[PDB]
Amino acid sequence: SNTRNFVLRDEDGNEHGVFTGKQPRQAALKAANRGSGTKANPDIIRLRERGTKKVHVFKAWKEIVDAPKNRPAWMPEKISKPFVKKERIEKLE
């Protein structure tokens, strides 16, 4: 199985995210849809975690963006959905 945990705080601060995502990019667009971006109170920042290799730089809101190299065979971010503005990401392999 493959699951990566990440930590961040929304409400216009960073981005709310404190849990594990099976896919870093594919779950990136899916995650904001529900909890990675409140939209009424979300933000853009490097969602990282120290100690281990965990760093995702993106922005998570609720609006129609473009699938930022999420490679999600289920659904990309090219659609009316949670906005996800990409930025360099680095995580534990």
Strands 17-21 and 84-91: unpaired
Q: How far is CA 20 from CA 4, 6, 64, 86, in A?
A: 5, 6, 24, 19
Q: Say how far apart CA 41 and CA 16 lie, in whole Å.
A: 9
Within 13 A of 41's CA, how many CA atoms are on the CB side? Answer: 5
Task: Give one DSSP letter per residue of the chain, joined into a string.
Answer: ---EEEEE-TTTTS--EEEEESSTTHHHHHHIIIII--SSS--EEEEEETTTTEEEEEEE-SEEE---S---TT--S-EEE--EEEEEEEE--
Give CA–CA dist 93/86, Å, rounded: 20
Q: Please give the backbone phi and psi of residue 32, each rounded to the nearest 5 degrees, phi first.
A: -65, -35
Q: In the PDB record, what is the listed experimental method?
A: NMR
Which whole-number Å values give the CA distances from 76 to 9, 23, 41, 53, in the listed order?
24, 13, 23, 25
**Domains, the chain, ordered by start:** 1-93 (3.10.470.10)
